[PDB]
Amino acid sequence: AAKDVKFGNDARVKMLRGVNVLADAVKVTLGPKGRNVVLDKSFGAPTITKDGVSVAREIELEDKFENMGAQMVKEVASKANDAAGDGTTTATVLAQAIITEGLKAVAAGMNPMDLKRGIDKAVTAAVEELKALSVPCSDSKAIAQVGTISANSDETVGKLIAEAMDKVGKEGVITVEDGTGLQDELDVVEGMQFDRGYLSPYFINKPETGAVELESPFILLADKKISNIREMLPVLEAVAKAGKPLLIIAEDVEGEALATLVVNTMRGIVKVAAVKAPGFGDRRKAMLQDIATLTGGTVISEEIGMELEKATLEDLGQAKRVVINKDTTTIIDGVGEEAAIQGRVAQIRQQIEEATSDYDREKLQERVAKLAGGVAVIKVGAATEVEMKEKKARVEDALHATRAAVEEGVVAGGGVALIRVASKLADLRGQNEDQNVGIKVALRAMEAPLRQIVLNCGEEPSVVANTVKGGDGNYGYNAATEEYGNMIDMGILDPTKVTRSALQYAASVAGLMITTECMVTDLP
Amino acid sequence: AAKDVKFGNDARVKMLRGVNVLADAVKVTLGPKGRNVVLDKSFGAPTITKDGVSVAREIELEDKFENMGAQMVKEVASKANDAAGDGTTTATVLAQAIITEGLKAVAAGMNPMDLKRGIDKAVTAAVEELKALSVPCSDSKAIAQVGTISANSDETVGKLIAEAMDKVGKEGVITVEDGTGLQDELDVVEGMQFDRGYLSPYFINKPETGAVELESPFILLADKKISNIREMLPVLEAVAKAGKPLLIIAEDVEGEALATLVVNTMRGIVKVAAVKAPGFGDRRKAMLQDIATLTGGTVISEEIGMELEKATLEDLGQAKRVVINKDTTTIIDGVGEEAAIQGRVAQIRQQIEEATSDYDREKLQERVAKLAGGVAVIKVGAATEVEMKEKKARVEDALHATRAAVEEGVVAGGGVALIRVASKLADLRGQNEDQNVGIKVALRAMEAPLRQIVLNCGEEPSVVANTVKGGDGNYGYNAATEEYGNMIDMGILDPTKVTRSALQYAASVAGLMITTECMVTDLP
Amino acid sequence: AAKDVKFGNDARVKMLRGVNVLADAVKVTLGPKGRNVVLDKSFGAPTITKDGVSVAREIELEDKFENMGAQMVKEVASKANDAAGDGTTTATVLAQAIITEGLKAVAAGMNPMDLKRGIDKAVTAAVEELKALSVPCSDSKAIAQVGTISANSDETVGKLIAEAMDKVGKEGVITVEDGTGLQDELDVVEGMQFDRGYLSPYFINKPETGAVELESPFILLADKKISNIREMLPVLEAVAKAGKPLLIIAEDVEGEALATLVVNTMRGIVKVAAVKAPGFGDRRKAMLQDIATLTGGTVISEEIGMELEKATLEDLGQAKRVVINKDTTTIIDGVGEEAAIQGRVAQIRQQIEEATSDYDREKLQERVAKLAGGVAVIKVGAATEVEMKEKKARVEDALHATRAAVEEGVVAGGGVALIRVASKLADLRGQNEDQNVGIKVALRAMEAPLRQIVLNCGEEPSVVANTVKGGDGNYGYNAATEEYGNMIDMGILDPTKVTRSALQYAASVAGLMITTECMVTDLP
Ligand SMILES: Nc1ncnc2c1ncn2[C@@H]1O[C@H](COP(=O)(O)OP(=O)(O)O)[C@@H](O)[C@H]1O
Ligand SMILES: Nc1ncnc2c1ncn2[C@@H]1O[C@H](COP(=O)(O)OP(=O)(O)O)[C@@H](O)[C@H]1O
Ligand SMILES: Nc1ncnc2c1ncn2[C@@H]1O[C@H](COP(=O)(O)OP(=O)(O)O)[C@@H](O)[C@H]1O
Ligand code: BEF
Ligand code: BEF
Ligand code: BEF
Ligand SMILES: [K+]
Ligand SMILES: [K+]
Ligand SMILES: [K+]
Ligand SMILES: [Mg+2]
Ligand SMILES: [Mg+2]
Ligand SMILES: [Mg+2]
């Protein structure tokens, strides 16, 4: 199709206009005194959000060159959300500041590539300084502070997240889902549990709770389909001689076998419960092997070279309790040696180290948690649906921030750490004068987040910026209280990883955006 | 698609305009002197309604920012209708008042988040005060008063609902359906009845009434499809030896078996009637087990491990009377031990405590009522169809309000209880001045429902408001007679749950709406 | 459909306008101080590129005659990219210069065909001069310099490419793919490796690394689907007698055979691994024969006249080590006589000499590299996706330029070699005055690339051009440092093939475009 071509300063002006539109929409949500943005939805009611990436993903402009600018700058927030899960608004603010200063430098006659090289050098030095400035975050009080700050200063969210992270451990998994009441609740499950219930309600022996309960059972792990009871007679006779319950986990069990088992259950010969194997395909085999290692049994598969009729008691696993209901089966205190379990989790860790997509990493981490740690679920409580969505977003942000802080440490919040780094980088020089101008551009842009935080509070950004720059260490400005003090003492903590990622992504996109000379897009 | 972005006060003004349009449409229907709204229908005649949620669901605006405001405020009425079934107009009025006062406070330079926090604190305190202010509603006179008030002061509706609730009991179910005459009628069914008639008109032994009547029969409950008569010969012979009728409840019965049964019926060997089992799938099995527990019999199923030919007299249930017609089968005075029925209803209650959707809860409640309570149907009478729909809506509103009042108690009506609570909360303070302003905003908005009720009557809302505030206790204004007096003595009662829910939902939505700074929507 | 027809000067003016639009878009990216062009994408974010052909392929104009001019001049860049992979911007600049000067000559009253003949003669003489002016490029320092220059002066890219070329050899293959980190990495694989993993995870004997490792195995190469183990019994017995592992490469292996093999593996009877044969169709057979020649075995096929049951130890290949994992199989140090390997690579070389499409040529090259050389992969590191794409394009350009420089030598860069050639051709004369004017047009156009390079730097092209023309040899202008000196000493090298190809293609298109008199296109 026919194209429209713009050259030089006209193209740069249109690009800056689009960048400014997107950044102005995003930046009103930054800090403890930021506000919400209402986003229209074609299907349903509008959503009200304080998240930078959610606002950024909805912005599209009528003018095509301004739209090109906005689409270019949207990638900063997208990448920050993908990487750290937090700090998208800060990244957008940094990108806009760099783009504006660099365009000013280009309009005065500077070489764009040298400016880009200077910006890259300054950002590398800043990343080194941030790494040197970090402190470990291991105590639960610091984790609670990080979660509170990341959830727009909500103490309950931070306390709940700290409790969940303490209970579940280091190898566990925490997820957030919608609740039903008005208060947040935490449900932590220890051991192995999968979303499979009994295949027949007649297996229930405790009708008061509507659940199947078995004490010290046998576990028959079959990686096959059981349809004819003839394959099951020998082991059934053996367990009847033993006199303890049996739990059969199979891919599926047919009607004749169900009828035989429910007949044998209530008649008193044997106590039997049957459920379906979790997962589909190779992952189902992996979960079956995990259960076998946990309970100390062996999976009966055709592909390995054994048949069901030849099974013995040694092949069956064992546990201490089994609780089954309509939806979930939990194995409690399965007898297994720590050597095999540790080997299995080490294998799954090595598998995690060689996987690409995040979904597969999440599934493997869930498996590791089921083997070694625990699983926690946080149910968010709210009166309405818009409130529920907003609070769920805040809780997820706090969860991501706590993970990042635990893995990489914390720095002073409120934009203070970036200012300290920029002050520490005041002697850095490049190869020529344009590279020095680029370094100065990056150092100036490093003060934008604090200025925006103060501007959102209704104060004067230049005065607060000068007062903070006059200090040293963790001295900073509390925007919620409007007071100066030690950032660490008042609990305004930022994870180091979030700050570093925001800086790197913003610089990477803005450096390329500065070097533009021509624009090609479709005609209106 | 391309987006339109508005910032700050322009966005807030447009949102307030949309909110005002929706609230102005809704509020004309509030109180004893509210009026009706005609809603156009694409398929058919227009509907005339006084319901707040019905009006709110139909409002959509041409301007997109005002439409976002209206769509946001619609959720209050939707949530109130879902929760209590009544009090949607009051919730909409409260939400509009909070939004207006909060936008005024924001325009003067207050921090929206602190205003929202103050509003939340005031609403929590108000909920506590309302709980402390409630009184029990157990007598039938108070229930009749509540039903009369909720049906727009219709004494016949309240009296009918009180009679139905007294006859049916605590565990029963009352439904409202269209009638045929000009008068409302109440039909109560005691015992077990399901919507299945006889499978052959030749079973009729009393052609005067066109129905099958059996005195002290046997009940054969088979969870299977009967096609060949050979399965049924032994029990038929045994019943013929016994000499009293038999009722066969099965999934279905084939033509050969029907022919054999109708041949044996009039020839005098045995008295037999056959009907289909109610329900489809698991619920059919649940109802079969319920009938088995009620009549003291056993269900003949293959999946449990028994066959029909091996049935004896023990497996057959017993009753005192069975009446069957074209459409319904009723079992009167089934012979069962109270322990089994109480256990079964306890199991179904525990199942109700673990259900999510309202349909499943309603079905379980109907089953519990069939086991223990009764079932009532109210047929509404009206000359035309618009009148029919209007009166049916009013009766449903009264039914929901009586349920809420029975479960949680009643307070003074006419907006008096909210005024008393706001007076009790006059000393509440927050953390800073913006939170105090938010508390004051909530307390001021708590007087809106009475002001709107009086304004609809054509009186002066400020004078009545001051006079009511000068009183104490249940002193209030009777808008129907234009007099002052004790609200409780005059029968103007509001359920506590409706008032509390309206307050909570209105606050939850309005607090978020106050904190908006930017709006993003599609271009016109 | 109806046509629009233009004659003479109007048509030539419109065509020149379209040429100028495309060339102005392209030329802003030329040289060390060129800038980037943002190209809009219908599906996704815009791409930022410094490549001439990428910009040229996106240009289409609303006016149909100008569009005809642009479409005509786009073929120069397309052909240069197809031929050398580099030098598209230089070719576009040369074509525009020739077109402009030739149109000026035509407008003064000269015969276009004689001008075209003079241009052709000058270009032939220039190609001869460039061939005489080239010097060999064999040392790694010169290759690194060429790669650095072609990657827009990135020393790391040039060093990495030189290392890869040294490690892999002359007959190897180097590819560029997306990385995951922020730094470029090089992975070189020696021997034969194909993208096939094991057919069963139970073959694994080293669970620590999750891989199958076999020391001094036998290799069974069969172009057949194995389903029944009965065909495989004799060779399995024989290798069990031998006592060394066996690797089975087949088209596919059925489930019964997998079960038998996995049962025999862990039981200590024999050590067996099985994978699928790489490729589909004739190429699969070629790869099987290549593996057979490498390992010294024979392929079992029905089409040659042998059966699997009759196989012996002589038919089985041998190797030193075999490593198999989820995705790749690697045969390390297969025992084979160099005579057969050399014959096979000579056969594939002769096949390469008689193939048309680039896909077949590159596949044959990969096969030759697997037989004799190595395979290297360069993973590009970048923070974002736009940066990733830009850097990947630069690395690919450097790779193509290094290949061209190795095969045909290098000349002075910066547009100096063309100027020297034009100076050497100052005595060339044609048959008549129009041909002399055409020769002068070509000689004048040969100075355009340096002028554009200097203009992009913000300097004065005429002054630099005169200063360079006043010199001799490799004297030139360094546009990065704004200094004069020896082109070769400061490492500004251009491959001879790229320069010659750009000149030839630009002349070929521009000569035809000069001779236009009438234009026929569709009505608007
Ligand atoms: N009380 C406070 N005083 C000063 N700065 C704060 C305070 N609370 C939070 N901040 C700062 O505000 C920022 C919060 O940004 P936020 O709105 O979450 O956007 P994002 O995290 O996506 O950049 C953090 O960098 C934090 O350092
Ligand atoms: N006679 C009366 N005098 C004063 N207030 C009344 C009288 N009758 C009803 N009301 C009040 O009017 C309100 C009923 O409003 P209604 O139109 O049913 O809307 P909603 O959907 O909010 O229930 C109740 O809060 C009740 O207290
Ligand atoms: N430092 C330098 N000084 C002068 N000329 C240079 C320098 N670096 C590169 N060049 C010249 O710039 C040209 C590179 O142009 P480029 O943008 O790659 O377009 P093309 O597609 O024609 O290769 C080469 O011909 C090279 O001779
Ligand atoms: F808006 Be940021 F991601 F907290
Ligand atoms: F109009 Be409300 F629901 F009584
Ligand atoms: F733009 Be050229 F192909 F380096
Ligand atoms: K934000
Ligand atoms: K109403
Ligand atoms: K270029
Ligand atoms: Mg955040
Ligand atoms: Mg009502
Ligand atoms: Mg190049």
Numbering used by the authors:
A (entry chain A), B (entry chain G), C (entry chain B): 2 to 525
Relevant lines from the article:
The bacterial chaperonin GroEL cooperates with its cofactor GroES in assisting the folding of roughly 10% of newly synthesized proteins, including proteins with α/β topology that fail to fold spontaneously. GroEL is a cylindrical complex of around 800 kDa containing two heptameric rings of 57 kDa subunits stacked back to back. The apical domains mediate substrate protein (SP) binding and the equatorial domains mediate ATP binding and hydrolysis. ATP-dependent binding of the lid-shaped GroES (a heptamer of 10 kDa subunits), capping the SP-containing ring (the cis-ring), results in the burial of hydrophobic surfaces on GroEL and displaces the bound protein into an enclosed chamber.
Encapsulation occurred following the addition of GroES and ATP-BeFx. For visualization of encapsulated SP, GroEL–GroES chambers were processed for cryo-EM structure determination. The GroEL subunits contacting MetK show only minor conformational rearrangements, with root mean squared deviation values of 0.5–1.0 Å compared with a new 2.5 Å cryo-EM structure of empty GroEL–(ADP–BeFx)7–ES chambers.
